[PDB]
Amino acid sequence: ADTIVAVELDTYPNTDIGDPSYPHIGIDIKSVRSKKTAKWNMQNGKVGTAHIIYNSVDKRLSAVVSYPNADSATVSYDVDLDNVLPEWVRVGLSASTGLYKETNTILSWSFTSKLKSNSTHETNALHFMFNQFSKDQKDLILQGDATTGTDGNLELTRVSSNGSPQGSSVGRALFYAPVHIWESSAVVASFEATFTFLIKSPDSHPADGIAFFISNIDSSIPSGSTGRLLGLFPDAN
Amino acid sequence: ADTIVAVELDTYPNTDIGDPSYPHIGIDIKSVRSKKTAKWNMQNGKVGTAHIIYNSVDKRLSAVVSYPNADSATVSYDVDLDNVLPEWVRVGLSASTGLYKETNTILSWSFTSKLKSNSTHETNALHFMFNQFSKDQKDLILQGDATTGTDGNLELTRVSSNGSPQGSSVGRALFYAPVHIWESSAVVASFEATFTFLIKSPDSHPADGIAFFISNIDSSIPSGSTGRLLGLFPDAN
Amino acid sequence: ADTIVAVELDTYPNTDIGDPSYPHIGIDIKSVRSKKTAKWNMQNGKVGTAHIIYNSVDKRLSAVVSYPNADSATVSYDVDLDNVLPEWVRVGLSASTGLYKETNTILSWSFTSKLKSNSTHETNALHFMFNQFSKDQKDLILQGDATTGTDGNLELTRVSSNGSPQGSSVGRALFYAPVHIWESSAVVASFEATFTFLIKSPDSHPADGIAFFISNIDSSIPSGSTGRLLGLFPDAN
Amino acid sequence: ADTIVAVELDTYPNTDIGDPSYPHIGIDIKSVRSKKTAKWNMQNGKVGTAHIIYNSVDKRLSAVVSYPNADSATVSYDVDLDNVLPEWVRVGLSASTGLYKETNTILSWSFTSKLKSNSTHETNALHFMFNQFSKDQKDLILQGDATTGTDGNLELTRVSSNGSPQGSSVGRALFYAPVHIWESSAVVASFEATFTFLIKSPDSHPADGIAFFISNIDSSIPSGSTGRLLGLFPDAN
């Protein structure tokens, strides 16, 4: 059973699992049923930016999702990630389709993590940046339908050769090195992740959306987690 | 009159102007009467570390002051820095003594400021790092009694040739370049400052403390701001 | 008399002052007559990129200029910058027009400088990044005709309200803080500079070019330095 | 067998395999017999620093090793690394002892790699920093005798419970994620690595050394590569 903390850009309302009745961003703590959601005006066909941030002083996980010249969507949840996640994790991106579909393309992805210890306050840091993805991206672990290199992008779910998306798809990309997201003797620890994404659907109704996630290091796509489950969770609980 | 936002490490309780009964860290918004303080166990003669952080999403100014192997002191305050400070600022370190005294020695200082715009989501960033100060530190604006180069440290208040700190001293170092801490169309702005310091006193009661501050670009040490005013405020209101 | 080190992007061959017969890049060490040049196929109207890098171990100043999908032009020169520059400098961008003309438009600028001392191996660093410029960009020093804000770009030379570049123009933007590009007791000092540019001319022959430069902190545009002099040298010697 | 590019800090003169007559640093291109060496006055028991850098414009691999207040040892070799190494590598630290011995203690390790592609000039970056190592350091592959966490240091070779270095020991630490050190379509690609070390020995002649290396990703310690082989090479050819 994986341990998942995620920020979801949820394009499709599943009101039967507590989704609000509109597209929304959310913070997910070991459940697809979001602890905090905000309305998000997803723009079919457009490049947007997501920013996710946390530090161990405020213990507050926050995300802003944005398109140029539009009002941002913002969401925040108070949570001690020390109590939720293991000491070492992987970080990734996840996306799915179900009966409705959309391209879940990633154009760029960056991440930064820093830990200062309570004994002689030495800082350990990790930073990665992808502004292009190649056919053979050896520092990503690609799971399920995820592919890299088409146009120099990361396509999290299946795209057919004519460029339209497919339903019932799920895939994820995880950064290869494990990440130390907390330590018991840290003065401050923090992270920030940003990615740019392009969600396009020929349907009237896109689905199912994209997530930034932090998981146990050995995490994999739960069985049957296409659709509303976003590649993250084994069920809707 | 200057506009001051500061994180104070207040070594001396002036209860007649609202200080708690004990050395305390605090967040100062345009006043020396902090908006929020927490108890701080200052350690005479030991090198400690301070970290200050803010971002435009949570709008929450937060600091942690620490010594190796001790419990941290932590303090936070909800505040929209957009509403308080001008678009352009200087960032700086400040310290004073009064009728009681201490060294106000800075061994390192770093600062990172980031803004991503709402118009195609381009990032502007400033970073500086001092892990040693030379006698001619041209990218530091030194005010009052502040000097650089002695042992490679920044001494914010006057220290005599024999190492002894002097009373009635006030001194400040501001980074040379102005800094853009907000813009009306930034999706996320954030900053982070760190410094190491060494407060030592031959007195029973050290005074008066060290502050990291953000100010209008033309800020200078207000008149008679030695002692309890920490080099920051013209008065005690 | 100023002391300039510079990387020139020279759009206009002035063979009377030792320019080669074609648009070219070059390294200039206290003279507009380049110590080294290489052929540069400038592309009228196209967004280009330049990179300048140097380190105190190799003592080699090297620059690459390129457009997406073209062969890069590269040039390098063996010079000990400690021998040439004062210890504190400013960094900047300069451009000019003369009887012929072009827009000298800067769309992004970044610079990182790092010094490690011979005792006790402590690093000082400076980093800045401009991915957009605003109307009042207080951390740039503008000289001559240079302005910021139109479209979020830095226009180093005069452009008219209608978009047309003007003859006989010259301007520079220097970053506000002086920079420590060297110190006597350094294990290693280095820097890198990147900028993107857009040179468009309605003339059959574009003039005069853009340079990245490093100078005495108190550099100004030498008088009459339009055209072939590039905002940089008082004469063609 | 493996493809290795290394910077050796070589404490023991093995004159039978072309080592010079004195402790030295060298650049190793697929052979233990360095393509260039410089004289290194290793200091028994004192914390040193090494810096290695390379960029694809100069195609010069260079290194500096120093102690506070000493003259530096520096060595360089003109080598085009995309000609030698595969497109994907891992970076690491290696060390060995044989009949004679020393502690190979790593106190800190940082690394930054960067690639700008020839289309659309997009940057890919990796950065890691260890200023402490814990007992369970999941983002390092440890091979052979290497251990982490004792005093927060990485011990590349065996040390017994009482601090005493052991003979016939070989160990390495690789960063976990693969690193993209060249791309055929790259404007400029570069890296820099820094480590701090403490080499301490009871022997009249300390042995054998520490290396920074870059290898095929699936590299392991070659068979019998203790002593003069430095845990890097299967033989001394």
Ligand SMILES: CCN(CC)c1ccc2c(c1)Oc1cc(N(CC)CC)ccc1C2c1ccccc1C(=O)OCCOCCOCCn1cc(CO[C@H]2O[C@H](CO)[C@@H](O)[C@H](O)[C@H]2O)nn1
């Ligand atoms: C009333 C709320 N609502 C709309 C928001 C809704 C409800 C039912 C369907 C809906 C939508 O859509 C479809 C669409 C299709 N197709 C695409 C046009 C053909 C493939 C077919 C059927 C329906 C059905 C459907 C009809 C009858 C029987 C079963 C289903 C069904 O979805 O059953 C599967 C599991 O659902 C069980 C009950 O769930 C009721 C909630 N409902 C169901 C859905 C669609 O859900 C699927 O698609 C979603 C979008 O990709 C994913 O998030 C889900 O993981 C996936 O199961 N949305 N809301």
Ligand SMILES: CCN(CC)c1ccc2c(c1)Oc1cc(N(CC)CC)ccc1C2c1ccccc1C(=O)OCCOCCOCCn1cc(CO[C@H]2O[C@H](CO)[C@@H](O)[C@H](O)[C@H]2O)nn1
């Ligand atoms: C060499 C001189 N020396 C150092 C040993 C010294 C001298 C005088 C005092 C000293 C110390 O201490 C105190 C302390 C207190 N209290 C301790 C918390 C509270 C009972 C009180 C009086 C003295 C006084 C004092 C007594 C009588 C008359 C005036 C003062 C006085 O402080 O004159 C100058 C301004 O004082 C006006 C009245 O202030 C009431 C607050 N009181 C006074 C002080 C000392 O304050 C001075 O020193 C502080 C510490 O550096 C600074 O923060 C202040 O800005 C600075 O003005 N602290 N609390």
Ligand SMILES: CCN(CC)c1ccc2c(c1)Oc1cc(N(CC)CC)ccc1C2c1ccccc1C(=O)OCCOCCOCCn1cc(CO[C@H]2O[C@H](CO)[C@@H](O)[C@H](O)[C@H]2O)nn1
């Ligand atoms: C390129 C076309 N050409 C060559 C046929 C040419 C063009 C202009 C002049 C020219 C020649 O010559 C003179 C000569 C004189 N005198 C004779 C020596 C004085 C009696 C006076 C004016 C002009 C001028 C002149 C007259 C009126 C206004 C301006 C100029 C001029 O800029 O002139 C700059 C001086 O050029 C002299 C010869 O140089 C040959 C190189 N070539 C290139 C240019 C254009 O030069 C200007 O424009 C260039 C491109 O922007 C800049 O790089 C230069 O720095 C700037 O001086 N001019 N010639």
Ligand SMILES: CCN(CC)c1ccc2c(c1)Oc1cc(N(CC)CC)ccc1C2c1ccccc1C(=O)OCCOCCOCCn1cc(CO[C@H]2O[C@H](CO)[C@@H](O)[C@H](O)[C@H]2O)nn1
């Ligand atoms: C430095 C002092 N020296 C020269 C006087 C010397 C030291 C040891 C031997 C030496 C010589 O010679 C031999 C010779 C043999 N034989 C005949 C060739 C076989 C019967 C056997 C053992 C020893 C050994 C030996 C004895 C006991 C345990 C190990 C060894 C050994 O490693 O020995 C490696 C011997 O290499 C042959 C001679 O090499 C001359 C160089 N000399 C030998 C060494 C020891 O080298 C070991 O230690 C070095 C330092 O750690 C490492 O760089 C080497 O990788 C590691 O093999 N260093 N310098």
Ligand SMILES: [Ca+2]
């Ligand atoms: Ca949903």
Ligand SMILES: [Ca+2]
């Ligand atoms: Ca006080």
Ligand SMILES: [Ca+2]
């Ligand atoms: Ca020219």
Ligand SMILES: [Ca+2]
């Ligand atoms: Ca050797």
Ligand SMILES: [Mn+2]
């Ligand atoms: Mn949801």
Ligand SMILES: [Mn+2]
């Ligand atoms: Mn106070």
Ligand SMILES: [Mn+2]
């Ligand atoms: Mn030229």
Ligand SMILES: [Mn+2]
């Ligand atoms: Mn050797």
